[PDB]
Symmetry: D2
Subunit: 290 residues, 4 copies
């Protein structure tokens, strides 16, 4: 049981919660870390900054097999642009394209069992969809949607039959969340549809499964960066109006992904699964209702 988790930058996101929960099941875990934060992550980890965040309970802490620099906007080394080659954080680093990381993992560890796509990006997220530029829009689809397909395409050859693949989405794909701008809504819409199409292909040709988890709000780094703030309203609305009022943890999403990545979920594929305390089911805020 080896899982590659792409899209860990710190201990505050969904990627860390998935790591944690899978570690609970003695899955070996490999982090794919975006190069602009790689060296920072590695320093904090080496200086024990996350040690407390690695604790599960009395007698298991997390065990991280490897941490690799990983940029899912580049499929192969030939795709790396000149702007990126001329960026100091990327220059120390090698083998950070989807193809390169897949080759490295395979040669180093052999075939793996699970894959987590826990990343997204969009230059113009601050702009509403109507005022998003073409370049901004396509950047969102490239980083947040296409990335999954290419990840699947390069990883299928290094995954065993009956492996499982997970991505994270948001309900803004399906119902309007003002503030979820820059084509991110569009990108999550595509990702949930592509999950179906990929499940057909991965199912039939590889007996590999793929699903997506539509998560509720978490104050991760990426979330707080959208412009108190958007995420703060989102959390507070969720905790007020969700069927289950308890605070939503990265690790609640971690448990469901760990189930979807295991053979326990073997008759589930191509699905969007809501791990959001049931908020998605509500139509009207509850205020007046006695």
């Amino acid at each position: 049981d080896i899982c590659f988790i792409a899209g860990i930058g710190d201990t505050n996101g969904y990627g860390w919660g998935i790591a944690k929960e899978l570690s609970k099941r003695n899955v070996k875990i490999i982090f794919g870390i975006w190069p602009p934060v790689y060296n920072i992550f590695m320093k904090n980890y080496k200086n024990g900054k996350f040690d407390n965040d690695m604790i599960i309970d009395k007698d298991k802490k997390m065990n991280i097999l490897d941490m690799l620099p990983f940029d899912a906007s580049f499929d192969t080394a030939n795709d790396i642009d000149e702007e990126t080659k001329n960026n100091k954080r990327y220059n120390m680093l090698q083998n950070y394209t989807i193809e390169d990381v897949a080759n490295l993992i395979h040669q180093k560890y052999g075939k793996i069992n699970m894959l987590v796509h826990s990343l997204a990006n969009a230059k113009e997220v601050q702009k509403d969809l109507l005022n998003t530029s073409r370049k901004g829009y396509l950047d969102a689809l490239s980083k947040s949607s296409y990335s999954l397909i290419s990840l699947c395409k390069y990883f299928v050859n290094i995954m065993k039959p009956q492996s499982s693949i997970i991505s994270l989405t948001y309900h803004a794909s399906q119902k309007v969340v003002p503030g979820y701008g820059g084509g991110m809504s569009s990108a999550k819409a595509a990702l949930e549809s592509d999950t179906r199409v990929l499940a057909y292909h991965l199912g039939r040709n590889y007996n590999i499964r793929i699903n997506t988890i539509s998560a509720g709000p978490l104050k991760s780094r990426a979330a707080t960066a959208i412009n108190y703030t958007f995420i703060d309203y989102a959390i507070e609305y969720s905790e007020k109006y969700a069927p289950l009022r308890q605070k939503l943890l990265s690790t609640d999403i971690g448990s469901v992904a760990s189930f979807l990545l295991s053979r326990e979920s073997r008759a589930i594929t191509g699905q969007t699964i809501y791990v959001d305390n049931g908020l998605n089911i509500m139509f009207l805020p509850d205020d007046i209702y006695r």
Copy 2:
């Protein structure tokens, strides 16, 4: 405390209830069967003749463990709802406490409060009839037995369940897309069960911190399935094994594994949901003939 599950809708070892039972016991969850009185005795005779002994094996070193088996009719909420004919029925008279209220109270006396509840049952007298030609009594019977029964079970079991408890039912994709042959208001009853799962999840969540979901299952050759009007169930299985993204035979235990996950605390942020456990066949639009190789 400790995990105890009531599974309403076990009439033999060939249905989803038994798969859920088997997967729950795998996880050392205590399990009580709710068995429809018309088939209660036949079930109890086979269980003691050892006829389920082989179906009860989990593996070389594990066997299922059944805490209790009770007569249960989800047609009746209380004793006073029991009609004249059923009273005169000899399959029912030597059996007591089989109304929804009664079985809850009985379970709560013998064992105290439970953690888990599975609704694994449906009935519809005119299932063989198309929806357009299904009578009012036919339609209301389907809704009564397959949809309202879940609501009543919830209502009565809510006060004998611990907080953080979980509830599941089973549904079929016929609710959302047209399956001819799924007659007699069964389609309508699953549509309602899926809608009711959401509304119940709101009320159960806010007031008791209890979760409820439904599993939309692919085809299984259960006793009931073979009672639908080749036969319906054989085409469904054959079609699904041919056209689903995943070609494996769908097993009751595949539903049971997912059920046990939804019933456990690993799914604590999931509620009100319809979860597809059907090898991904729901995601397909057209048959795959021209395209495949």
Copy 3:
């Protein structure tokens, strides 16, 4: 073109709005009027109380072909219960069952081509779903959902091919609306599913189309009989729907009239939202 419109009690509901819009397209309209309110309706009509409400524009007035008593609880006269036999409001009336009304319409005007189901009922609507009784839930399904099926079964043989059928639903079927109790949510969910299954059977065997309009909130008599629920619903919708305009009964009538016509002949089994776009929204807008 002749349309039977089941579920008119007054000018303030969706049925009247549909009637108004159909009459705009020269469709002849037959009202199915629930017996409790039949007398009152015919009295008010006779004394000219609906005369302003019948004007479409200054060159066109609604024309109403007939007004027939109608209770969708009863498939045949054999189904009428003792309580109803003790109701004077019914004892003075005839041919109000689904079977009888279809026969009467067919005997009187021949085959028709449009049918509108604009009705619902549930005795325990004030009770949340969890504390709704079996009798109450089944009542909601019987009156609000099964009634569509039976209306279809009885009208199919007095309808021409290329006919069209419409009912009204609410988004409580698909997303939680607290206060929409009694199993009304369950009934709308069943109606939307049955709309698909009926579309298949009616499509292949009769070349007949059937769809459901999911309407936004309107301050009808039945709505008010449920802040109050309906004023909350309306305020929220007007606060948050993509479109600010007040939702009018005739905005539904306009879509119903399109769906009932040949212009929508490639559309069947569909739930069409006519609600100022409210259904698309996730979160309140305020801070944004």
Copy 4:
């Protein structure tokens, strides 16, 4: 009432069917024609090759207000690349960018009432999703999805009160259609999501409505160019298994588009309306049951 129809390259598509049904309600019609096929269209039209296809009934025939070159690849003139600029079919054409045509329509005809998006393109449609390149994918999203956004953005300030917008999508967005490759599934998924997001911003800022029609299969030039071929299979299945067994015509979609573009439909926005003889509602083939 004036409608601009983006995506008519011949009389065999849904664009033509919409133009026909709108002309039937005396709407004035402007075509946005892709420059690569603009000349041949103008030749064919000028020679009478479309006269029979312009016949509506006994006494009415289509009346076209204008026919303009138009490429939804380019938002403004500054976006046009040098290869395109030198291409023979572009270098005598002008004002064919999204912004330029909007401004041309405006000064030529004043403000308009209706806008139809009836285009799609994807350079790698013959490749299944998993095997689609990043560039192909983004090209599908750029031409088939982002273009709607850009059309909206440049047109809103040239639209009259009570204006309405439609585009055309396909059910492969929601359920798997093998063969609908190249990220077209993805693009249609984006389009349907974006239709909701646009409906919100357009409704609240401009009281403008936008919907999408999910059409059944039509033997158009674009459909034939995909691939039993893909389209012949799709039509055969639709005609055998739809609740309504009848040939699906471009005017069937035209009729719905006309409605949605009109004031009869003013309480409808952000929706995906299925015009497919009810095929979308079916689960499995019908063979056994009958």
